[PDB]
Amino acid sequence: AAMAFTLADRVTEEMLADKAALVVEVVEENYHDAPIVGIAVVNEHGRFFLRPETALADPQFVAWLGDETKKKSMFDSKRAAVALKWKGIELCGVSFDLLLAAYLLDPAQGVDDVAAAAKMKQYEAVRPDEAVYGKGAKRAVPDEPVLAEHLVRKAAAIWELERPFLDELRRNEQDRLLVELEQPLSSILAEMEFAGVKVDTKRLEQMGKELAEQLGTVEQRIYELAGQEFNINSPKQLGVILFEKLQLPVLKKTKTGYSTSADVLEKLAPYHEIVENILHYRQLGKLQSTYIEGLLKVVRPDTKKVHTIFNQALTQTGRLSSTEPNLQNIPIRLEEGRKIRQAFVPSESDWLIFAADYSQIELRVLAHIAEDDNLMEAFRRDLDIHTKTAMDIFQVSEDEVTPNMRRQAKAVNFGIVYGISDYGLAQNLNISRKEAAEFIERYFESFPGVKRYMENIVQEAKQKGYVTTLLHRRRYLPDITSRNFNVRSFAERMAMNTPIQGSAADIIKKAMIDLNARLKEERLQAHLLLQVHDELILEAPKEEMERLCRLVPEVMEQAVTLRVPLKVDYHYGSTWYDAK
DNA sequence: CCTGACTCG
DNA sequence: TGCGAGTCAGG
Ligand SMILES: OC[C@H]1O[C@@](CO)(O[C@H]2O[C@H](CO)[C@@H](O)[C@H](O)[C@H]2O)[C@@H](O)[C@@H]1O
Ligand SMILES: [Mg+2]
Numbered sequence: 001a002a003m004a005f006t007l008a009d010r011v012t013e014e015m016l017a018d019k020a021a022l023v024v025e026v027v028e029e030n031y032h033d034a035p036i037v038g039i040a041v042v043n044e045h046g047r048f049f050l051r052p053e054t055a056l057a058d059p060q061f062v063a064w065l066g067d068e069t070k071k072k073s074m075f076d077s078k079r080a081a082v083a084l085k086w087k088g089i090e091l092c093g094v095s096f097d098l099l100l101a102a103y104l105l106d107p108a109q110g111v112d113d114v115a116a117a118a119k120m121k122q123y124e125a126v127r128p129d130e131a132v133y134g135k136g137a138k139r140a141v142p143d144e145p146v147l148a149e150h151l152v153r154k155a156a157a158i159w160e161l162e163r164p165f166l167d168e169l170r171r172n173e174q175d176r177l178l179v180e181l182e183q184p185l186s187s188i189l190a191e192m193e194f195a196g197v198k199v200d201t202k203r204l205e206q207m208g209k210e211l212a213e214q215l216g217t218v219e220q221r222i223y224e225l226a227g228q229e230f231n232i233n234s235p236k237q238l239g240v241i242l243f244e245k246l247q248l249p250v251l252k253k254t255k256t257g258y259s260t261s262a263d264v265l266e267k268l269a270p271y272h273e274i275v276e277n278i279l280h281y282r283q284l285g286k287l288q289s290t291y292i293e294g295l296l297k298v299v300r301p302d303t304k305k306v307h308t309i310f311n312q313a314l315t316q317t318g319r320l321s322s323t324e325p326n327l328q329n330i331p332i333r334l335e336e337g338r339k340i341r342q343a344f345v346p347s348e349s350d351w352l353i354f355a356a357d358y359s360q361i362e363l364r365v366l367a368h369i370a371e372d373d374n375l376m377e378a379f380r381r382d383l384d385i386h387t388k389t390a391m392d393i394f395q396v397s398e399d400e401v402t403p404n405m406r407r408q409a410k411a412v413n414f415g416i417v418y419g420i421s422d423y424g425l426a427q428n429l430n431i432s433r434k435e436a437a438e439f440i441e442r443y444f445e446s447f448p449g450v451k452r453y454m455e456n457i458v459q460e461a462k463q464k465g466y467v468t469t470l471l472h473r474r475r476y477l478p479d480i481t482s483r484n485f486n487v488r489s490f491a492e493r494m495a496m497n498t499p500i501q502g503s504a505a506d507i508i509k510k511a512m513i514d515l516n517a518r519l520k521e522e523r524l525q526a527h528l529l530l531q532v533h534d535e536l537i538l539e540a541p542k543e544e545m546e547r548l549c550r551l552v553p554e555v556m557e558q559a560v561t562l563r564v565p566l567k568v569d570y571h572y573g574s575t576w577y578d579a580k
Numbered sequence: 581c582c583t584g585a586c587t588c589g
Numbered sequence: 590t591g592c593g594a595g596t597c598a599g600g
Contacts, residue, residue, distance in 0.1 A: 103596060115596070120588095134592095160582080233585080233597090233598050233599065234599055234600080235583080235584055235585070235600095236597080236599080236600070254584085255583075255584090259583080260584085261584075262586080267584095282585070283586080285585095285586080285598090286586045286597080289596085289597055290586080290587075290595095290597065293597095294597070314594085315593095317593060319589085319593060319594075321593090321595070322594085322595075323596090324595095324596095325595090325596085326594085326595045326596070327589080327593060328587095328588060328589075328594075328595080329586065329588035329589085329596085330587080330588075332588075333587085333588080357589095362589090362592095378596075385592090413590075415591055415592095416593085417591095417592070418591050418593090419591065419592065421590060421591050422590070422591090423590055423591070436591095486590075489584080489590070490590070493590075493591070496590095497591095497592045498592085498593095500592085507598090511589085532588075532589065533588085533589040533593085533594090534589060535589085
């Protein structure tokens, strides 16, 4: 059938009730400076559709949007909030966000539209956005009749679904997780995205020129060593050259043809001088295509800023992700790529970039949750955790720990956090499974509490059907009971890792909320720009650095109280590169 | 659109 | 098979 609603030509009093489901539709996937195609409001008085030009030009409606005492229930309120920010309109009073509610209830559902969330509660009186707008080249806003009913149906679904979603959240002990963590964070992410990060495009272009030169040199050096020209960026063409023309050993047979992955070539390097060059070529090639050309493509022509979008409802562990561009994967590990960060600068003159990061948050969280005496003491002494681990598993004094020993102990710690497995560790350290198993046994002997936790968390996952984080985020693991070893093992590793990675995510999210409250209380001009999993990047007047050096670490370190202290390091400088 | 390469915590 | 993510050239 059809859903009744008023297609209003002007805003009316009854459309401004103090409780309503609100839809401010932005169809463009990237909502920055994007158009709002329509508005829908559902409240105690009825269902309404408003043309944006009319609603957003009405002083009464705008005041309503900005009145924190007028409560709104929405789906992906950040999208609407940011689209409105670009129009100079403030959105306040969002008391419920269906996207975040659904995400917390079950991140694996992949809910990305009202229909998907409603289907969770057997409500299907609303169409999927894709069905209405289509996808790809066929994407398009339907005629008003169609658009209007869709927005109203979405608003009606939100209106109806709020109660049941909140009820289940409460049963899961996630009510505060939504109301006191994710929703307030949503508003903070909106400010960060809207603020954007300034890019020194002239610096990027010059780096681009220099890379084009080096890339040319390496490219020619590769054709020279191969005795012919070919597409180096073609794993297929590359494979023929390496394993056929040059007769290099085939140590890995992937899906189709051969494998020319990083660790495969790293092992082939000793056989021919071409391998090193191919690796370097790929390194520089990625910098050019993605961090030079790709980045320049998304920099706003006028402001020279990039405005990422933090997807707050995607990862299975509670982390955020970043896109167009992804500002959470800018090079830093290799010096040549790290230079890219010199192109990220403060948005105002005489300002600086300030970066604060948690030191070993994952292992500190593990110590807390597993309550391992040895691991908690290590952090209480603020020891170099990898050196300490080597001392324990290899039974040597601190002075006897060699560089190679620390390296392997470090790999063991990663394995432990990721969900330790003979095969996995062996593959990473390039050693036998038995040897890797020996390392693992030694680790558990030194950290019996961690062994206990890994055993218990897997059992708990099987009993309850899910695992939880410090702030009650959850992840269902049905595969934990699979009689297929490989499938079950994936689930077991997830049971071990999710509480760690997820809890670390919970912590920094609270740190961000606490920090913004502090910045506001102090009326500092400093503001957050980015979050990179265990670090927070801000920009501020140079005159605020001394205050930031004390405030940021303290806030981050005190976000939550664990059985071991939380440690935060920080640096600042003229560019992101210099904030080291 | 899919694969395999690279980037990050 | 070690955990969690995104982007791009070639197929
Ligand atoms: O507004 C972000 C919000 O929208 C979703 C859809 O529910 O993702 C859309 O927007 C992202 C940023 O432009 C795209 O990467 C994604 O492809 C598009 O569907 C959510 O995942 C997200 O929380
Ligand atoms: Mg760190």
